[PDB]
Amino acid sequence: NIPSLTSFAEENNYQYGYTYAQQQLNKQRQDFERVRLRPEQLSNIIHDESDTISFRSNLLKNFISSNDAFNMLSLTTVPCDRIEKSRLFSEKTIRYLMQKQHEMKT
Amino acid sequence: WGKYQTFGVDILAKLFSLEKPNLNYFKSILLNNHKDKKLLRRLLNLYNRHNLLNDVVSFLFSAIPLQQVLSQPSLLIDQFSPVISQSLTSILVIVQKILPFNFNKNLPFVWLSSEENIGSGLLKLSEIILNINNSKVLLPSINISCVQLIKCLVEKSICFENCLNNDPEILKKIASIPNLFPTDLEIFQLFTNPSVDIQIINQYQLLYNLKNDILTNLE
Amino acid sequence: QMEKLDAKLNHLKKLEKFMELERKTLERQQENLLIQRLNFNQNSSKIVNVLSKEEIRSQIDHFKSMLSKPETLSIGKNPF
Amino acid sequence: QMEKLDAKLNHLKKLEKFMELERKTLERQQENLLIQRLNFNQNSSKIVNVLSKCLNLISEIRSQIDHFKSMLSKPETLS
Amino acid sequence: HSHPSDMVIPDHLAELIPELYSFQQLVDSEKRLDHFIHLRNLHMKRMVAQWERSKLSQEFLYPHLNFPNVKFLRIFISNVSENQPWNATWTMRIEGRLLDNVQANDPAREKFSSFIESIVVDFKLESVKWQYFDGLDIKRVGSENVECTISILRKSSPEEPFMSYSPQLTAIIGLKSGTSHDAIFSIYKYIHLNELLTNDQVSIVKLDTQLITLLPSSLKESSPDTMKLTDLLSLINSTHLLPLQPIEIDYTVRVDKASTYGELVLDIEVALKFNNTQRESQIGAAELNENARELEQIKPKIALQDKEITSVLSNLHESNKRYRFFKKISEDPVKALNECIASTSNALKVLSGDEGYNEDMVRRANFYKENEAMLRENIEVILSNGRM
């Protein structure tokens, strides 16, 4: 097949109305461009991450994540002088930067 | 991740097939009725010379998964033969019919030696595709597309150096690509196997005749 | 860390370029040697098959006998 | 990320050693080229020397053999 | 669930924490490092495959200049002939001497007896053979003179692939010996430089005056036949190749000369199981498999690190959400405390499944005075269709 560019012309094709070579080329045209342009009627209809995203699950997760983070704010009756600060380094990041600074003189 | 970029390399492959409005407009955009003259000259310098050409060619060198099909052997090329074929067709159109003067930077040289070594990737891909069909429709076109693309990139690099004439020591730097320019032993292998084509070994022997003319002009 | 990474990367890339250039030069010199050898032997055989048409019999047979057995080098170990 | 990078930067040394293997192979090919060049030179010299001996002992025809002597007088016989 | 989305720290965190650029261009600095390993691996898959193809070639067969598998061995062609008037004696001999620091009376020496394939001295008295001692001692009777063509076959083991060629092929190729790959490659590179390649297909090859004598008995010198290359490659396999390597020397045992036990020279060399072991086509494959085992050892420690990288990235996004929620409140605590309520009851209306307008908005009369436009449309639409 792989019919033509002349078979795609408007003269050899039907229009809103109101030969043999044309009716032979339009067989191969409609037999080529209906196995090429047909959509996939099976799975892999996900196509990406941002099509199977769920508004209901994210809305439920945000309803939980706002409620518990607001219960963290108001109901935690620890005064501001008593809120102890967290460490800016870990127990492993403080070992690796003692190791690499020891090995930095090479 | 998603095959959405593979749709763009077919828009660019089919819209380059007309020498009139489709390629004249693309030529005047990539290289350079009375208000859009002001609009186009406003949009082109809002896009941050020749950043558009190297962006389009570097994106078309993406979506050819060289790293993925060469990491692990026939399934991935049998799945990605149309996107590879149309991307190589688009790059061949841009190389042959757009690049030949207002340039100020050597674009085929910074595509050939851009630390990713896409020419070696195309040569290994041609080896891989030549080692499946002789040991599934588009592959004889893809082999000749790869070899002709490497040949046209090297020749346009030398021609751009002859036009610009600012970097004289490039004949060393072209011949110092670690897996370009296939050796005489694999071409000796290709001239013996009956399962190969005629145009494949013709493009290979043309590439080797380019390799010899590198080393003669080197000194 | 980034500096040591880019230093070793540049060194390995320059080593790759040097090895590739030397391999290309070796392949070129091998092919040129083979071509010159074929040319010399073809020319010598052509002029000896032309030239043959006493003393000239002895010298022509001497050159044809020397051409019939090309020789190589004496490469071995050192006994003493 | 730095613990991830240091593993590959320790991995690079074997790929460095493969370059030394390639340098060994290229030096062996250089040895082959030198020995084959030496075996070519002496054979070409001996053959052109006994060719000169034959043209010394040999003496539409005269101009042909004198053209042959113009050929093999200098080592242009590769051309 | 390999999400490509959450590998990006796009703008809102990198502007606040400047180390994230130092993180992000770290990761990109890794991404061009591993790719350099990838172009390394396709390099090491290449050169080994380059060398197993060129294993047969004499680029890696004749140079072995660390230790070549060859030991030279000289042989005296001796002749003792007395008891004649000056019974003509014919004590002809062949003596083998290993070129070493070795002696003549050395016990268990690598002579021409312990190590020679064959020495077939073809005499003109009675011819002798050598089926695979301190010397070759031949003596028959006779009177006048005897000439003997001394022929020495070298140790023609199957692991020395350097074989001789035809008397014609040496005149065109230039190699008096070598492997079959040189015999298949030298005429191949000879064809292209004198345009004997033809097209009708690449297989056809014009013959030459130097190539009609390649096959003189096959009768191709009678017709200049531009034939296929297949007949040429099927020609040079046993029509010219593999003579089991002979050396020859012509000499006569003389009637009056005394001896040649210490006067005559020869040149025959030979151990052989060294250079075919430490070849680059197998050492490179062993190094490739070593690096592959090292990659497969180093990979799960990388995967266990990537697990924790993703688990810390998820906590970074979760903490970014709570930082934004705690900052927008602290900036304006009356407008954020009206957006926190109006997006909580609305977050319940959607999750419950209910829909519609706000009940307390549409209950008043100014709603139907500001929406005077759409009601005159909808009342006519419902009345004209007959549903009012």
PDB file of C-alpha atoms in Angstrom, chain B:
ATOM      1  CA  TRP B   1       7.911   8.231  31.773  1.00  0.00           C
ATOM      2  CA  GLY B   2       5.624   8.926  28.833  1.00  0.00           C
ATOM      3  CA  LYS B   3       5.647   8.814  25.058  1.00  0.00           C
ATOM      4  CA  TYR B   4       4.388  12.391  24.620  1.00  0.00           C
ATOM      5  CA  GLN B   5       7.666  13.673  23.196  1.00  0.00           C
ATOM      6  CA  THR B   6       7.495  10.994  20.486  1.00  0.00           C
ATOM      7  CA  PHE B   7       4.492  12.787  19.004  1.00  0.00           C
ATOM      8  CA  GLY B   8       6.547  15.939  18.454  1.00  0.00           C
ATOM      9  CA  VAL B   9       9.278  14.213  16.432  1.00  0.00           C
ATOM     10  CA  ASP B  10       6.568  13.166  13.965  1.00  0.00           C
ATOM     11  CA  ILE B  11       5.093  16.662  13.668  1.00  0.00           C
ATOM     12  CA  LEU B  12       8.594  17.859  12.845  1.00  0.00           C
ATOM     13  CA  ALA B  13       9.130  14.906  10.501  1.00  0.00           C
ATOM     14  CA  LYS B  14       5.953  15.481   8.479  1.00  0.00           C
ATOM     15  CA  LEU B  15       6.005  19.290   8.470  1.00  0.00           C
ATOM     16  CA  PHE B  16       9.511  19.315   6.953  1.00  0.00           C
ATOM     17  CA  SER B  17       8.347  17.432   3.858  1.00  0.00           C
ATOM     18  CA  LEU B  18       7.169  20.484   1.876  1.00  0.00           C
ATOM     19  CA  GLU B  19       9.758  22.778   0.209  1.00  0.00           C
ATOM     20  CA  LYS B  20       7.257  25.700   0.033  1.00  0.00           C
ATOM     21  CA  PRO B  21       5.625  27.244   3.187  1.00  0.00           C
ATOM     22  CA  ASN B  22       6.626  24.376   5.571  1.00  0.00           C
ATOM     23  CA  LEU B  23      10.393  24.596   4.920  1.00  0.00           C
ATOM     24  CA  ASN B  24      10.693  28.243   3.870  1.00  0.00           C
ATOM     25  CA  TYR B  25       9.141  29.376   7.161  1.00  0.00           C
ATOM     26  CA  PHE B  26      11.292  26.917   9.121  1.00  0.00           C
ATOM     27  CA  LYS B  27      14.403  28.155   7.291  1.00  0.00           C
ATOM     28  CA  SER B  28      13.660  31.835   7.926  1.00  0.00           C
ATOM     29  CA  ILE B  29      12.958  31.061  11.583  1.00  0.00           C
ATOM     30  CA  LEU B  30      15.961  28.838  12.323  1.00  0.00           C
ATOM     31  CA  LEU B  31      18.583  30.870  10.469  1.00  0.00           C
ATOM     32  CA  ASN B  32      17.526  34.468  11.169  1.00  0.00           C
ATOM     33  CA  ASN B  33       2.182  41.051   6.792  1.00  0.00           C
ATOM     34  CA  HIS B  34       3.639  44.223   8.294  1.00  0.00           C
ATOM     35  CA  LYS B  35       2.988  43.868  12.034  1.00  0.00           C
ATOM     36  CA  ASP B  36       4.138  40.248  12.362  1.00  0.00           C
ATOM     37  CA  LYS B  37       7.518  41.394  11.059  1.00  0.00           C
ATOM     38  CA  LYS B  38       7.682  43.263  14.367  1.00  0.00           C
ATOM     39  CA  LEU B  39       6.204  40.302  16.255  1.00  0.00           C
ATOM     40  CA  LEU B  40       8.663  37.711  14.928  1.00  0.00           C
ATOM     41  CA  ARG B  41      11.664  39.940  15.632  1.00  0.00           C
ATOM     42  CA  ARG B  42      10.285  40.425  19.154  1.00  0.00           C
ATOM     43  CA  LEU B  43       9.753  36.705  19.747  1.00  0.00           C
ATOM     44  CA  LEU B  44      13.138  35.618  18.396  1.00  0.00           C
ATOM     45  CA  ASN B  45      15.239  37.741  20.766  1.00  0.00           C
ATOM     46  CA  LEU B  46      12.871  36.944  23.638  1.00  0.00           C
ATOM     47  CA  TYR B  47      13.999  33.328  23.208  1.00  0.00           C
ATOM     48  CA  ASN B  48      17.315  33.018  25.047  1.00  0.00           C
ATOM     49  CA  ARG B  49      22.474  33.552  18.594  1.00  0.00           C
ATOM     50  CA  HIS B  50      21.289  30.240  17.062  1.00  0.00           C
ATOM     51  CA  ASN B  51      19.933  28.914  20.352  1.00  0.00           C
ATOM     52  CA  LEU B  52      16.811  27.753  18.496  1.00  0.00           C
ATOM     53  CA  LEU B  53      18.706  25.583  16.001  1.00  0.00           C
ATOM     54  CA  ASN B  54      20.881  23.836  18.567  1.00  0.00           C
ATOM     55  CA  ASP B  55      17.879  23.437  20.891  1.00  0.00           C
ATOM     56  CA  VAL B  56      15.807  21.752  18.158  1.00  0.00           C
ATOM     57  CA  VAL B  57      18.684  19.512  17.050  1.00  0.00           C
ATOM     58  CA  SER B  58      19.602  18.598  20.638  1.00  0.00           C
ATOM     59  CA  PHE B  59      15.971  17.756  21.388  1.00  0.00           C
ATOM     60  CA  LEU B  60      15.809  15.654  18.235  1.00  0.00           C
ATOM     61  CA  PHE B  61      18.930  13.858  19.439  1.00  0.00           C
ATOM     62  CA  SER B  62      16.860  13.194  22.510  1.00  0.00           C
ATOM     63  CA  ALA B  63      13.977  10.690  22.057  1.00  0.00           C
ATOM     64  CA  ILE B  64      16.495   8.476  20.221  1.00  0.00           C
ATOM     65  CA  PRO B  65      17.163   6.194  23.202  1.00  0.00           C
ATOM     66  CA  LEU B  66      20.820   5.383  22.574  1.00  0.00           C
ATOM     67  CA  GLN B  67      21.626   4.796  26.247  1.00  0.00           C
ATOM     68  CA  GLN B  68      18.595   2.591  26.875  1.00  0.00           C
ATOM     69  CA  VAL B  69      18.876   0.300  23.857  1.00  0.00           C
ATOM     70  CA  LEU B  70      22.648   0.080  24.259  1.00  0.00           C
ATOM     71  CA  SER B  71      22.553  -0.578  28.009  1.00  0.00           C
ATOM     72  CA  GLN B  72      20.593  -3.834  27.839  1.00  0.00           C
ATOM     73  CA  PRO B  73      18.568  -6.317  22.568  1.00  0.00           C
ATOM     74  CA  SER B  74      15.999  -6.510  19.778  1.00  0.00           C
ATOM     75  CA  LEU B  75      12.785  -5.673  21.640  1.00  0.00           C
ATOM     76  CA  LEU B  76      13.586  -2.019  22.303  1.00  0.00           C
ATOM     77  CA  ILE B  77      14.590  -1.245  18.718  1.00  0.00           C
ATOM     78  CA  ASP B  78      11.574  -3.195  17.428  1.00  0.00           C
ATOM     79  CA  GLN B  79       9.414  -1.018  19.687  1.00  0.00           C
ATOM     80  CA  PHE B  80      11.136   2.305  18.928  1.00  0.00           C
ATOM     81  CA  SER B  81      11.950   1.976  15.219  1.00  0.00           C
ATOM     82  CA  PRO B  82       9.331   4.559  13.999  1.00  0.00           C
ATOM     83  CA  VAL B  83      10.338   7.333  16.424  1.00  0.00           C
ATOM     84  CA  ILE B  84      14.024   6.657  15.671  1.00  0.00           C
ATOM     85  CA  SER B  85      13.360   6.677  11.916  1.00  0.00           C
ATOM     86  CA  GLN B  86      11.390   9.922  11.949  1.00  0.00           C
ATOM     87  CA  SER B  87      13.861  11.626  14.300  1.00  0.00           C
ATOM     88  CA  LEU B  88      16.743  10.679  12.007  1.00  0.00           C
ATOM     89  CA  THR B  89      14.736  11.930   9.019  1.00  0.00           C
ATOM     90  CA  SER B  90      14.135  15.280  10.742  1.00  0.00           C
ATOM     91  CA  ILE B  91      17.803  15.667  11.727  1.00  0.00           C
ATOM     92  CA  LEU B  92      18.871  14.759   8.184  1.00  0.00           C
ATOM     93  CA  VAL B  93      16.502  17.403   6.784  1.00  0.00           C
ATOM     94  CA  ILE B  94      17.867  20.048   9.186  1.00  0.00           C
ATOM     95  CA  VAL B  95      21.490  19.106   8.432  1.00  0.00           C
ATOM     96  CA  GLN B  96      21.207  18.920   4.655  1.00  0.00           C
ATOM     97  CA  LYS B  97      18.696  21.656   3.833  1.00  0.00           C
ATOM     98  CA  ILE B  98      18.975  24.317   6.561  1.00  0.00           C
ATOM     99  CA  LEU B  99      22.589  24.522   7.750  1.00  0.00           C
ATOM    100  CA  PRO B 100      24.182  25.745   4.513  1.00  0.00           C
ATOM    101  CA  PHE B 101      26.445  32.842   6.116  1.00  0.00           C
ATOM    102  CA  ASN B 102      25.547  34.517   9.407  1.00  0.00           C
ATOM    103  CA  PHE B 103      26.783  31.920  11.907  1.00  0.00           C
ATOM    104  CA  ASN B 104      29.317  32.736  14.614  1.00  0.00           C
ATOM    105  CA  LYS B 105      29.664  29.327  16.278  1.00  0.00           C
ATOM    106  CA  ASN B 106      30.374  25.852  14.915  1.00  0.00           C
ATOM    107  CA  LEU B 107      27.175  23.875  15.494  1.00  0.00           C
ATOM    108  CA  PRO B 108      28.015  20.445  13.934  1.00  0.00           C
ATOM    109  CA  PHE B 109      31.322  20.474  15.807  1.00  0.00           C
ATOM    110  CA  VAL B 110      29.603  21.085  19.145  1.00  0.00           C
ATOM    111  CA  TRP B 111      27.137  18.345  18.265  1.00  0.00           C
ATOM    112  CA  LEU B 112      29.863  15.865  17.320  1.00  0.00           C
ATOM    113  CA  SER B 113      31.988  16.471  20.440  1.00  0.00           C
ATOM    114  CA  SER B 114      29.439  17.366  23.130  1.00  0.00           C
ATOM    115  CA  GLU B 115      30.801  14.887  25.763  1.00  0.00           C
ATOM    116  CA  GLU B 116      27.895  12.504  25.069  1.00  0.00           C
ATOM    117  CA  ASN B 117      29.423  11.168  21.817  1.00  0.00           C
ATOM    118  CA  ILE B 118      26.231  10.652  19.853  1.00  0.00           C
ATOM    119  CA  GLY B 119      28.193   9.675  16.752  1.00  0.00           C
ATOM    120  CA  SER B 120      29.581   6.637  18.556  1.00  0.00           C
ATOM    121  CA  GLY B 121      26.040   5.901  19.713  1.00  0.00           C
ATOM    122  CA  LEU B 122      24.737   6.018  16.144  1.00  0.00           C
ATOM    123  CA  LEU B 123      27.609   3.824  14.951  1.00  0.00           C
ATOM    124  CA  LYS B 124      26.970   1.242  17.677  1.00  0.00           C
ATOM    125  CA  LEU B 125      23.248   1.423  16.840  1.00  0.00           C
ATOM    126  CA  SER B 126      24.034   0.711  13.186  1.00  0.00           C
ATOM    127  CA  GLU B 127      26.174  -2.239  14.331  1.00  0.00           C
ATOM    128  CA  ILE B 128      23.290  -3.527  16.488  1.00  0.00           C
ATOM    129  CA  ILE B 129      20.689  -3.153  13.718  1.00  0.00           C
ATOM    130  CA  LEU B 130      23.091  -4.759  11.233  1.00  0.00           C
ATOM    131  CA  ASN B 131      23.592  -7.687  13.638  1.00  0.00           C
ATOM    132  CA  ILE B 132      19.918  -8.676  14.101  1.00  0.00           C
ATOM    133  CA  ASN B 133      18.319  -8.805  10.632  1.00  0.00           C
ATOM    134  CA  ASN B 134      21.282 -10.725   9.208  1.00  0.00           C
ATOM    135  CA  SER B 135      21.688 -12.883  12.336  1.00  0.00           C
ATOM    136  CA  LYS B 136      11.291  -5.318  11.047  1.00  0.00           C
ATOM    137  CA  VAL B 137      10.582  -3.079   8.059  1.00  0.00           C
ATOM    138  CA  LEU B 138      12.307   0.269   8.728  1.00  0.00           C
ATOM    139  CA  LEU B 139      15.771  -1.041   9.640  1.00  0.00           C
ATOM    140  CA  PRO B 140      17.430  -0.792   6.156  1.00  0.00           C
ATOM    141  CA  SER B 141      16.401   2.860   6.122  1.00  0.00           C
ATOM    142  CA  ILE B 142      17.665   3.429   9.674  1.00  0.00           C
ATOM    143  CA  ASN B 143      21.143   2.022   8.919  1.00  0.00           C
ATOM    144  CA  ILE B 144      21.648   4.320   5.925  1.00  0.00           C
ATOM    145  CA  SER B 145      20.187   7.240   7.898  1.00  0.00           C
ATOM    146  CA  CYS B 146      22.709   6.724  10.724  1.00  0.00           C
ATOM    147  CA  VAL B 147      25.733   6.409   8.440  1.00  0.00           C
ATOM    148  CA  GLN B 148      24.691   9.323   6.216  1.00  0.00           C
ATOM    149  CA  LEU B 149      24.056  11.449   9.309  1.00  0.00           C
ATOM    150  CA  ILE B 150      27.564  10.770  10.660  1.00  0.00           C
ATOM    151  CA  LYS B 151      29.055  11.499   7.224  1.00  0.00           C
ATOM    152  CA  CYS B 152      27.120  14.745   6.781  1.00  0.00           C
ATOM    153  CA  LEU B 153      27.981  15.885  10.311  1.00  0.00           C
ATOM    154  CA  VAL B 154      31.723  15.372   9.753  1.00  0.00           C
ATOM    155  CA  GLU B 155      31.643  17.006   6.310  1.00  0.00           C
ATOM    156  CA  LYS B 156      29.617  19.978   7.549  1.00  0.00           C
ATOM    157  CA  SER B 157      32.002  20.382  10.492  1.00  0.00           C
ATOM    158  CA  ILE B 158      34.944  20.621   8.080  1.00  0.00           C
ATOM    159  CA  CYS B 159      32.992  22.948   5.770  1.00  0.00           C
ATOM    160  CA  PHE B 160      31.991  25.195   8.687  1.00  0.00           C
ATOM    161  CA  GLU B 161      35.636  25.339   9.759  1.00  0.00           C
ATOM    162  CA  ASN B 162      36.667  26.308   6.222  1.00  0.00           C
ATOM    163  CA  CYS B 163      34.011  29.035   6.138  1.00  0.00           C
ATOM    164  CA  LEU B 164      34.680  30.409   9.643  1.00  0.00           C
ATOM    165  CA  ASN B 165      38.474  29.815   9.872  1.00  0.00           C
ATOM    166  CA  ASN B 166      39.060  30.457  13.562  1.00  0.00           C
ATOM    167  CA  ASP B 167      39.844  26.985  14.955  1.00  0.00           C
ATOM    168  CA  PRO B 168      42.646  25.397  12.887  1.00  0.00           C
ATOM    169  CA  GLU B 169      43.331  22.367  15.114  1.00  0.00           C
ATOM    170  CA  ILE B 170      40.096  20.482  14.533  1.00  0.00           C
ATOM    171  CA  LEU B 171      41.409  17.764  12.187  1.00  0.00           C
ATOM    172  CA  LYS B 172      43.036  16.265  15.261  1.00  0.00           C
ATOM    173  CA  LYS B 173      39.900  16.878  17.329  1.00  0.00           C
ATOM    174  CA  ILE B 174      37.626  15.275  14.728  1.00  0.00           C
ATOM    175  CA  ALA B 175      39.857  12.207  14.379  1.00  0.00           C
ATOM    176  CA  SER B 176      40.120  11.905  18.195  1.00  0.00           C
ATOM    177  CA  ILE B 177      36.559  10.624  18.691  1.00  0.00           C
ATOM    178  CA  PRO B 178      36.944   7.280  20.476  1.00  0.00           C
ATOM    179  CA  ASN B 179      34.388   5.136  18.616  1.00  0.00           C
ATOM    180  CA  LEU B 180      33.632   7.000  15.389  1.00  0.00           C
ATOM    181  CA  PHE B 181      34.929   5.861  11.959  1.00  0.00           C
ATOM    182  CA  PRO B 182      34.599   2.049  11.790  1.00  0.00           C
ATOM    183  CA  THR B 183      37.778   0.049  11.272  1.00  0.00           C
ATOM    184  CA  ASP B 184      38.817  -1.732   8.104  1.00  0.00           C
ATOM    185  CA  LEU B 185      38.186  -5.151   9.673  1.00  0.00           C
ATOM    186  CA  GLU B 186      34.429  -4.714  10.102  1.00  0.00           C
ATOM    187  CA  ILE B 187      34.222  -3.301   6.572  1.00  0.00           C
ATOM    188  CA  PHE B 188      36.162  -6.389   5.445  1.00  0.00           C
ATOM    189  CA  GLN B 189      33.480  -8.399   7.247  1.00  0.00           C
ATOM    190  CA  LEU B 190      30.723  -6.375   5.554  1.00  0.00           C
ATOM    191  CA  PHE B 191      32.149  -6.946   2.054  1.00  0.00           C
ATOM    192  CA  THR B 192      31.993 -10.737   2.518  1.00  0.00           C
ATOM    193  CA  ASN B 193      28.571 -11.439   4.035  1.00  0.00           C
ATOM    194  CA  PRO B 194      25.863 -11.862   1.362  1.00  0.00           C
ATOM    195  CA  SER B 195      23.115 -10.882   3.813  1.00  0.00           C
ATOM    196  CA  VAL B 196      24.138  -7.213   3.763  1.00  0.00           C
ATOM    197  CA  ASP B 197      22.786  -4.651   1.301  1.00  0.00           C
ATOM    198  CA  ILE B 198      24.597  -2.674  -1.389  1.00  0.00           C
ATOM    199  CA  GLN B 199      23.779   0.819  -0.141  1.00  0.00           C
ATOM    200  CA  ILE B 200      24.797  -0.098   3.421  1.00  0.00           C
ATOM    201  CA  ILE B 201      28.314  -1.105   2.400  1.00  0.00           C
ATOM    202  CA  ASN B 202      28.380   1.826  -0.040  1.00  0.00           C
ATOM    203  CA  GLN B 203      27.742   4.304   2.788  1.00  0.00           C
ATOM    204  CA  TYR B 204      30.258   2.427   4.952  1.00  0.00           C
ATOM    205  CA  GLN B 205      32.950   2.533   2.274  1.00  0.00           C
ATOM    206  CA  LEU B 206      32.196   6.241   1.640  1.00  0.00           C
ATOM    207  CA  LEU B 207      32.644   6.805   5.416  1.00  0.00           C
ATOM    208  CA  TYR B 208      35.974   4.967   5.290  1.00  0.00           C
ATOM    209  CA  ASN B 209      37.064   7.070   2.307  1.00  0.00           C
ATOM    210  CA  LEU B 210      36.238  10.089   4.464  1.00  0.00           C
ATOM    211  CA  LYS B 211      38.358   8.565   7.252  1.00  0.00           C
ATOM    212  CA  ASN B 212      41.354   8.212   4.922  1.00  0.00           C
ATOM    213  CA  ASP B 213      40.959  11.800   3.712  1.00  0.00           C
ATOM    214  CA  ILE B 214      41.020  12.934   7.335  1.00  0.00           C
ATOM    215  CA  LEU B 215      44.423  11.334   7.904  1.00  0.00           C
ATOM    216  CA  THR B 216      45.917  12.507   4.605  1.00  0.00           C
ATOM    217  CA  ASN B 217      44.956  16.138   5.255  1.00  0.00           C
ATOM    218  CA  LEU B 218      46.038  15.796   8.909  1.00  0.00           C
ATOM    219  CA  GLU B 219      49.708  16.343   8.013  1.00  0.00           C
TER     220      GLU B 219
END
